[PDB]
Amino acid sequence: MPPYTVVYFPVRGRCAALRMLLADQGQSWKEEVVTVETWQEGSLKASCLYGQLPKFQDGDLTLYQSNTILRHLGRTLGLYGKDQQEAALVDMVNDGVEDLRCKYISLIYTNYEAGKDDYVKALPGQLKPFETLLSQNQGGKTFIVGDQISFADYNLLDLLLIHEVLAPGCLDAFPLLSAYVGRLSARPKLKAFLASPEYVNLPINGNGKQ
Amino acid sequence: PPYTVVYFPVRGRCAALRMLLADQGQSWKEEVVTVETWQEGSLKASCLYGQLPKFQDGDLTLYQSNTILRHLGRTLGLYGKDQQEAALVDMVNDGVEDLRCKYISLIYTNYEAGKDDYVKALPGQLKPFETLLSQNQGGKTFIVGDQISFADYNLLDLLLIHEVLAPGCLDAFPLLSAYVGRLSARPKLKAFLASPEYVNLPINGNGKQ
Numbered sequence: 270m271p272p273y274t275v276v277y278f279p280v281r282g283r284c285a286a287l288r289m290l291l292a293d294q295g296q297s298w299k300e301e302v303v304t305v306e307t308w309q310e311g312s313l314k315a316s317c318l319y320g321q322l323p324k325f326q327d328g329d330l331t332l333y334q335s336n337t338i339l340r341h342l343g344r345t346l347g348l349y350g351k352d353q354q355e356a357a358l359v360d361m362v363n364d365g366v367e368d369l370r371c372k373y374i375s376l377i378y379t380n381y382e383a384g385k386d387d388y389v390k391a392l393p394g395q396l397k398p399f400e401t402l403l404s405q406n407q408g409g410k411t412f413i414v415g416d417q418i419s420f421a422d423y424n425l426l427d428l429l430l431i432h433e434v435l436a437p438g439c440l441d442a443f444p445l446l447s448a449y450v451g452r453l454s455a456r457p458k459l460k461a462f463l464a465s466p467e468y469v470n471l472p473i474n475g476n477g478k479q
Numbered sequence: 480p481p482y483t484v485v486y487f488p489v490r491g492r493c494a495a496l497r498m499l500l501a502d503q504g505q506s507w508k509e510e511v512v513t514v515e516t517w518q519e520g521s522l523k524a525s526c527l528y529g530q531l532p533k534f535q536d537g538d539l540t541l542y543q544s545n546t547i548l549r550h551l552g553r554t555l556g557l558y559g560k561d562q563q564e565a566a567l568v569d570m571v572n573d574g575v576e577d578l579r580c581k582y583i584s585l586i587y588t589n590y591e592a593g594k595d596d597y598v599k600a601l602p603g604q605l606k607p608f609e610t611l612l613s614q615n616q617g618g619k620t621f622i623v624g625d626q627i628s629f630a631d632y633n634l635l636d637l638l639l640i641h642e643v644l645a646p647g648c649l650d651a652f653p654l655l656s657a658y659v660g661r662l663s664a665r666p667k668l669k670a671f672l673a674s675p676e677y678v679n680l681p682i683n684g685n686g687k688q
């Protein structure tokens with residue numbers, strides 16, 4: 270059997286980036302799907318460390334927390350910078366991505382109708398830092414940190430993709446981010462994954478909003 | 480090194496990294512930024528995400544409180560003994576961060592109407608850290624493994640600010656209670672926690688705690 274298992278709801282959500290990472294690195298994994306019905310039964314939830322999914326298994330190592338999973342795969346597959354300084358910058362990018370992801374999640378699940386206009390107005394100022402990081406790394410022609418891909422690239426890519434669904438054209442203001450999405454999305458194993466039913470037939474979020 | 484911490488005159492998201500630096504015998508410079516200096520706009524515009532803390536380690540400039548914690552963890556060997564422990568350290572820290580975000584939302588956004596619900600939910604929010612202790616050498620050492628990690632300083636801070644918010648919140652948790660006592664008694668950390676530089680700073684920026 271595969272050494273990796275992803276336990277999650279039938280949504281892209283906080284597993285999208287880590288799935289992209291695994292597919293792009295040609296790793297095999299099992300998807301264990303938890304229905305809302307099963308979740309409401311309560312036993313699985315009670316057994317989860319923080320009462321939430323995703324849960325991830327790497328052999329007998331059981332992890333919770335989407336960013337913990339990303340960092341763990343980053344470490345074990347060599348997607349965490351070439352040295353200690355690049356590692357810090359990778360973290361800095363990922364923490365920025367997480368901060369914006371949390372704002373996105375708050376919009377989607379708690380305030381979509383009343384909040385979308387303001388959110389979209391504020392969006393360029395929230396995306397700009399990633400454009401700046403790109404502009405300061407080899408003119409934005411490679412990755413978000415250094416000259417090799419990192420877990421932060423996959424997470425940032427996911428963040429950009431869902432924001433283009435939320436606010437079509439939002440990357441027209443950001444030439445380097447725009448080209449970056451194109452480039453990464455064209456990586457053959459990733460392109461194939463992103464076009465596959467496994468990805469395409471899951472909704473982005475759990476409540477029908479995007 | 481040497482290190483510079485750039486932040487507002489509060490404990491906030493720098494408290495844990497300060498505890499770490501002091502406990503580890505490191506020296507650093509505090510650059511205090513006043514609310515007045517921030518409102519001018521220039522420093523803020525130079526910050527990657529328009530926010531503090533900002534941190535300098537020689538020629539390296541970092542933003543993001545957990546990035547700074549992880550960098551110190553990595554460079555000072557406070558990140559577990561191997562990749563497996565490193566993942567566990569991250570898992571703890573990410574749990575600490577989630578609860579810290581809820582705390583921050585309460586304090587700054589909804590203190591008066593939200594505190595009652597927050598406090599009632601608190602035991603179930605703290606229990607995971609007691610369980611983690613229970614599963615690691617009977618709770619007698621650190622949150623992960625046999626050596627201190629950056630996640631211990633972050634968890635310690637989280638627990639200390641929660642005992643201010645809800646006195647007695649650790650009483651039902653013997654391992655966490657004992658852990659806070661043990662860590663707080665480490666000599667350099669004890670000295671730091673007793674010092675004016677810690678005690679005379681407010682926890683948060685808005686008078687609430």
Ligand SMILES: N[C@@H](CCC(=O)N[C@@H](CS[As](SC[C@H](NC(=O)CC[C@H](N)C(=O)O)C(=O)NCC(=O)O)c1ccccc1)C(=O)NCC(=O)O)C(=O)O
Nearest residue numbers: 278280282283320321322323334335336371374378475577
């Ligand atoms: N008391 C809960 C409130 C309920 C809640 O979970 N709200 C969500 C948006 S619902 As979605 S993602 C599934 C969710 N897992 C996480 O939030 C993990 C966060 C962690 N930091 C990480 O990065 O891994 C979950 O497990 N919910 C179940 C539960 O808590 O009972 C969804 C909905 C329906 C079907 C499929 C998927 C929220 O706002 N989360 C915050 C965030 O994701 O940043 C509480 O305390 O949050």
Ligand SMILES: N[C@@H](CCC(=O)N[C@@H](CS[As](SC[C@H](NC(=O)CC[C@H](N)C(=O)O)C(=O)NCC(=O)O)c1ccccc1)C(=O)NCC(=O)O)C(=O)O
Nearest residue numbers: 368487489491492529530531532543544545580583587684
């Ligand atoms: N819409 C704004 C809201 C403004 C805001 O910052 N709210 C705070 C609570 S105020 As405090 S802590 C200083 C703060 N830095 C961060 O939030 C960094 C987050 C990062 N993930 C990390 O971990 O480092 C900041 O720089 N604020 C200034 C600014 O943004 O211009 C304080 C107040 C007064 C005096 C001293 C200290 C908030 O809710 N932050 C989120 C969090 O900490 O999780 C927005 O976009 O945030």
Ligand SMILES: [Ca+2]
Nearest residue numbers: 508509510511
């Ligand atoms: Ca000074």
Ligand SMILES: [Ca+2]
Nearest residue numbers: 555556557626
């Ligand atoms: Ca050590």
